[PDB]
Design a protein around this ligand. Structure first.
Ligand SMILES: [Mg+2]
Ligand SMILES: [Mg+2]
Ligand SMILES: [Mg+2]
Ligand SMILES: [Mg+2]
Ligand SMILES: [Mg+2]
Ligand SMILES: [Mg+2]
Ligand SMILES: [Mg+2]
Ligand SMILES: [Mg+2]
Ligand SMILES: [Mg+2]
Ligand SMILES: [Mg+2]
Ligand SMILES: [Mg+2]
Ligand SMILES: [Mg+2]
Ligand SMILES: [Mg+2]
Ligand SMILES: [Mg+2]
Ligand SMILES: [Mg+2]
Ligand SMILES: [Mg+2]
Ligand SMILES: [Mg+2]
Ligand SMILES: [Mg+2]
Ligand SMILES: [Mg+2]
Ligand SMILES: [Mg+2]
Ligand SMILES: [Mg+2]
Ligand SMILES: [Mg+2]
Ligand SMILES: [Mg+2]
Ligand SMILES: [Mg+2]
Ligand SMILES: [Mg+2]
Lengths: 206, 51, 203, 185
RNA sequence: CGCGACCUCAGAUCAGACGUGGCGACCCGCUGAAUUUAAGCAUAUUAGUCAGCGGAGGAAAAGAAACUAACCAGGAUUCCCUCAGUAACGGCGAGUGAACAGGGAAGAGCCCAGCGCCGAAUCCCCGCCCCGCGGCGGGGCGCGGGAAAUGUGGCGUACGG
RNA sequence: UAGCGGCCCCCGGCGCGCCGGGCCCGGGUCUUCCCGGAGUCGGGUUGCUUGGGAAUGCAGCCCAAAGCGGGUGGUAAACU
RNA sequence: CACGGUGAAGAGACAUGAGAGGUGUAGAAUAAGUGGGAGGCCCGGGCCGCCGGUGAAAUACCACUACUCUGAUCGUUUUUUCACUGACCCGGUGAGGCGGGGGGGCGAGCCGGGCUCUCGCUUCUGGCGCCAAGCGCCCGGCCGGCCGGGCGCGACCCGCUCCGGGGACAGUGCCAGGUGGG
């Protein structure tokens, strides 16, 4: 997409903030719409947008990790949970789905994605849980802030998505850099070029 | 034919539009250039329409 | 200047303004005779591109020519020979209709030299060409040092020997590997030089 | 159906605007060969012992000093022999903001300068006495052409039949109208 | 209505010029066969030849790359030697058939339009005087007439300006 | 006939000199601007032509341009 | 295919864009799937839920699109019909009264008057018919008289094709198939 009309859209919603003055927490989003790709057919695109600002104020995160993910996690204030604690979660598929539905997206260590398909593989992708691996550097400080808001553009049984980006309190040029990342990643991820779109509503939430 | 080609590109029959432009102007390179500048002027009209 | 605007606007012949003007003017020139004096160039920038200067001595003669190929003028379509020469209908003239316009204008006004010519309109039955002619004995042309190649007797009837632009385009002349058959000055010169036998004295 | 780029030359200045413009133009006429030869003599008898403002004539001069922004008013004749000499020129003047008017008579417009015909003239500057006069001309002219150009650009000419065919249609359609009045009685 | 511009188009035994026609060995533009060969013949060949038509000059045409090349690159055109009876075309038959590079003969380059700036600075013609006057030209004077702003001249052209 | 043999005319070409008029002109360095020929190229088709072979050139007809573009780079075509 | 246009309907293509129905239940119903969400709306309080409850995806909050249907007006093109004329064509003429608008004589129905249509002055005979009478308004020459001109009605005005007849079809240009002992 071009950037001039996207500038016009972000100016009209930066001055459409005064139309709303939000209190259900200040965050906006955008939509993406596609025209003639069959929702039941192949060439399904499935990718992750790395985003650098995370303009979503309360991103809900937890970690699922082994030893040496204890003390640094307690000092960064993210709750830590062990393999026998996942056995405690596995003692019923009652509470674990509710905690994973209250939380948005997880991340987990190397050897616990080995144990997440015990009997709970199809239980956990029922709520869309593929926990993302850490590394051997063992520094999750702001790397979790980077892994969050990596928006999954995924094709499923109908032809549209919506992406959670933005608050007008942040700076405009970085916000349009975020929407630029989203739109050029999806235009590259599509089977054809930017002709496949209908429009873009980078609007307020409410 | 230029009006008919932007009318094809509005409905986003881009492959048939390029074939029709090839049948009109001749060489495929000139056809690609013609379709690109028709996409440019049609994008100019669309970016004029929102303001 | 205005001439680049005029030139780029003559380039957009399928536009509405040009289609209207070509239709209206083509009707006008179809209403007149096949060879008539034009008081000024219809295409001023095109004329001055081809060599016109708005001064005394340059005249414009506008020509109507009939379109199509050259039907072979044999009685009842019978060319009495081998079937490779039985063609009557779909044959073509080796020179262009523009050069036909120049030679008609020159052979009428034989006291004038054909400089160049250009296209001004057509329909299905006629092509219309404006030919620039020059009077080599007018004193403006006779006393301008920049224009007196035409005063010399070697430039009598350039349009009949193909020395004009539309005349030289039909001869196959040019530089390079596409024009090996006109090395010399012509197809004539190349054929003569290649189909000769150099019998030397001492061999 | 005349295209609007040609049809815009059929809409002109009226008599009052034309006479007020010509009255201004009669004072900025370029000097003839006589009052240039004697102007040479008058310069020589004082320098051998600034140029006042003039009208710029012709499509090339006027086109060049319109795209240079240097024009302040431009008058274009309605009736040039190929109209393509000037059919671009209202569009050019509108984009570069130059006040343009279309005047009847290239014969009059080339009687301004001392010739037979001229396509267009242009006021580049005027004296301080006539600056208010050019202001009143420009404020009259710009309300007809430069501000109305987006309406002018889509207004097509011609498409009006013969009076005999218009009369035949009028009789037929009034018969249909009176019969439609007879429908309800 | 009438007068005057302009445009377009007429008329004149108006003033001054120019073309026609001939020759045609050589040259340029078209048009263009068949005999012949293929042991027949139709594509091919003859042949872009003869015949036909138009236009010249003491030469014509061509000519300063919308080129050759693929190199350590050359450098308008024309002509000679070689390329070469070769690449290639061909009922792949009969037959046809170049080009570049190389060595020479010659050797020369340049100009517009366009883009721009300079009070159209430009051109033609008639009157008078002086000169020269058998290639009608030079200087000056004309409140002499036209052309030309629908673009003349000066600078300037791809090697850049 | 031979001869850098003679004589007399004529027509040039070649030098210097005078009058009038014209022309009152450049190279380098840096900065700022500007730059191009369209029913033409090109495509299809037809016919002729060429050694030019999926088309060498020309022409008719139809389509019909662009400007970091176009043409060529001897096998049609796409990407670079 | 081109020259080759104008308008109005019929038949399509359903593009800009308006409205709209979703059942293996579970659960606030009837969640078409998905991104994300800790505190709107209504004006400190109130409202289901995000959570409980819990099924094949858990629904607050705002979202995009869809699947299909329907209407709307500019889908914009294509196609058929009906018309138009300005290209083109044909005919007639010494391109002689074409088309409207008047104004006038009749008729039709109403109260001297408005409106629709119509007509425009030649048929009793093998004559003749032009080159204006008449009326009105001006102008001139000789002392109201004579002589001698001009304009306007008579012979209405306005126009954009001479008048008709066809017409985007004949036709012509270039290709394509058929036919073709001419
Ligand atoms: Mg030939
Ligand atoms: Mg020569
Ligand atoms: Mg060519
Ligand atoms: Mg005479
Ligand atoms: Mg034989
Ligand atoms: Mg034999
Ligand atoms: Mg035989
Ligand atoms: Mg041959
Ligand atoms: Mg001959
Ligand atoms: Mg001759
Ligand atoms: Mg001679
Ligand atoms: Mg030459
Ligand atoms: Mg060479
Ligand atoms: Mg050999
Ligand atoms: Mg041969
Ligand atoms: Mg060589
Ligand atoms: Mg100039
Ligand atoms: Mg010059
Ligand atoms: Mg050059
Ligand atoms: Mg002797
Ligand atoms: Mg051949
Ligand atoms: Mg290549
Ligand atoms: Mg190749
Ligand atoms: Mg037969
Ligand atoms: Mg026979």
């Amino acid at each position: 997409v071009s950037r001039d009309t996207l500038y016009e859209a972000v100016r009209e919603v930066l001055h459409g903030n005064q139309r709303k003055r939000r209190k259900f927490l200040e965050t906006v989003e955008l939509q993406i719409s596609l025209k003639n790709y069959d929702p039941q057919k192949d060439k399904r695109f499935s990718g992750t947008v790395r985003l650098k600002s995370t303009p979503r104020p309360k991103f809900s995160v937890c970690v699922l990790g082994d030893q040496q993910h204890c003390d640094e996690a307690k000092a960064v204030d993210i709750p830590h949970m062990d393999i026998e604690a996942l056995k405690k979660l596995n003692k019923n598929k009652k509470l674990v789905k509710k905690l994973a539905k209250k939380y948005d997206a997880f991340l987990a260590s190397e050897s616990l994605i080995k144990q997440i398909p015990r009997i709970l593989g199809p239980g956990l992708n029922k709520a869309g849980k593929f926990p993302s691996l850490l590394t051997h550097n063992e520094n999750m400080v702001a790397k979790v802030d980077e892994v969050k808001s990596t928006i999954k553009f995924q094709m499923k049984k109908v032809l549209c998505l919506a992406v959670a980006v933005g608050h007008v309190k942040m700076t405009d040029d970085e916000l349009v850099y975020n929407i630029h990342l989203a739109v050029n990643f999806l235009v590259s991820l599509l089977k054809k070029n930017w002709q496949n779109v209908r429009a873009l509503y980078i609007k307020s939430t409410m | 034919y230029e009006r008919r080609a932007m009318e094809l590109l509005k409905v986003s029959k881009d492959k048939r539009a390029l074939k029709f432009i090839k049948k009109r102007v001749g060489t495929h390179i000139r056809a690609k250039r013609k379709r690109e500048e028709l996409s440019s002027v049609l994008a100019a009209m669309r970016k004029a329409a929102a303001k | 200047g205005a001439y680049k605007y005029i030139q780029e606007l003559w380039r957009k012949k399928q536009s509405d303004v040009m289609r209207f003007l070509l239709r209206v003017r083509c009707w006008q020139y179809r209403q007149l005779s096949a060879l008539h004096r034009a008081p000024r160039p219809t295409r001023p920038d095109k004329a001055r591109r081809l060599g016109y200067k708005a001064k005394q001595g340059y005249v414009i003669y506008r020509i109507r020519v009939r379109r199509g190929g050259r039907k072979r003028p044999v009685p009842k379509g019978a060319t009495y020979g081998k079937p490779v020469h039985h063609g009557v209908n779909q044959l073509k003239f080796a020179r262009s209709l523009q050069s036909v316009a120049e030679e008609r204008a020159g052979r009428h006004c034989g006291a004038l030299r054909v400089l160049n010519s250009y296209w001004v309109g057509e329909d299905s039955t006629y092509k219309f060409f404006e030919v620039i002619l020059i009077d080599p004995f007018h004193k403006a042309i006779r006393r301008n040092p920049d224009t007196q190649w035409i005063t010399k007797p070697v430039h009598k009837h350039r349009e009949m020997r193909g020395l004009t632009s539309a005349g030289r385009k039909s001869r196959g002349l040019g530089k390079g590997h596409k024009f090996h058959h006109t090395i010399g000055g012509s197809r004539r010169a190349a054929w003569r030089r290649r189909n000769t036998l150099q019998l030397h004295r001492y061999r | 159906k005349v295209p609007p780029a040609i049809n815009q030359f059929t809409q002109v200045l009226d008599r009052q605007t034309a006479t007020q413009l010509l009255k201004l133009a009669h004072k900025y006429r370029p000097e003839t060969k006589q009052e240039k030869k004697q102007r040479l003599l008058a310069r020589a008898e004082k320098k051998a012992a600034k140029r006042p403002p003039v009208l710029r004539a012709g499509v090339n001069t006027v086109t060049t000093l319109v795209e240079n922004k240097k024009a302040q008013l431009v008058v274009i004749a309605h009736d040039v022999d190929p109209i393509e000499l000037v059919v671009f020129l209202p569009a050019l003047c509108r984009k570069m903001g130059v006040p343009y008017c279309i005047l009847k008579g290239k014969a009059r417009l080339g009687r301004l300068v001392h010739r037979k015909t001229c396509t267009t003239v242009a006021f580049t500057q005027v004296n301080s006495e006539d600056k208010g006069a050019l202001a009143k001309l420009v404020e009259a002219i710009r309300t007809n052409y430069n501000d109305r150009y987006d309406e002018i650009r889509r207004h097509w000419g011609g498409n009006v039949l013969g009076p005999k065919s218009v009369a035949r249609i009028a009789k037929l359609e009034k018969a249909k109208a009176k019969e439609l009045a007879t429908k309800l009685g």
